[PDB]
Amino acid sequence: QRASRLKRELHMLATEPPPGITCWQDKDQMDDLRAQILGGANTPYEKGVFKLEVIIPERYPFEPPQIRFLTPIYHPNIDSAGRICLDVLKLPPKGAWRPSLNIATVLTSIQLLMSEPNPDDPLMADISSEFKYNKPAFLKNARQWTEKHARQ
């Protein structure tokens, strides 16, 4: 059932990936994956390439994929170790993971989170206040962080 579902998902990611998103097997196992999200336009992350680690837990699809950024990113919801505060990556009642979602849909949500942060549920408190109260300085720091760590 699990193995069977992962094959369906890998196939879909290889053939019909979402715009801007790529995901693939590192080795010869279906539960240790990698992905890549391209920084969107009309965002400070633009022209940046962000790599992620995607671990599929042993009880998938009843527990969510465990995802973290490997490429540094300056964002209120993402910490210095790459942990993402996002509802679709957490179990209910607080979270919104359900088995009718998949790897592609959560990667797309992380992409949306990059365009549209939530300072209501921050992981980086100083970055979160800068985003609310000094928006131009946030945008400047994000673009600098992008150019340094996500390019060449």
Ligand X SMILES: NCc1nc2ccccc2s1
Q: What are the catalytic residues?
A: 85
Tell me if 20 contacts ligand X by CB under 6 A: no
Query: What's the min distance (Å) between Cβ of 4 and ligand X?
Result: 32
DSSP letter (8 states) at residue 25: E
Q: In b/e form, how buried is each residue of 19-51, taking b as 16+ CB within 10 angstroms?
A: eebbbeeeeeebeebebbbbbbeebbbeebebe
Closer of 50 and 60 to ligand X (Cβ): 50
Closest approach of Cβ 122 to ligand X, in Å?
A: 14
**Scanning residues 65 to 104, which ones bind ligand X (CB under 6 A)?**
69-70, 72-73, 78, 80-82
Number of residues that bind ligand X (CB under 6 A): 8
With CB atoms as reference, the residue minimizing the distance to ligand X is 82
Helix, strand, or coil (residue 150):
coil
Q: Do 64 and 86 meet the contact criterion of CB atoms below 8 Å apart? A: no
User: From the CB of 79, what's the least distance to ligand X, in Å?
Assistant: 7
Interacting positions 33-72 with ligand X (CB under 6 A):
69-70, 72
Q: Distance between CA 41 and CA 79 in Å, rounded?
A: 23
Residue 84: CB minimum distance to ligand X, A: 10
Its sign, for the CA torsion 99, 26, 146, 126, is positive
x/- binding map, residues 111-140, to ligand X, per CB under 6 A? ------------------------------
Its sign, for the CA torsion 96, 102, 103, 108, is negative
In the complex, the residues that contact ligand X under the rule CB under 6 A are: 69-70, 72-73, 78, 80-82
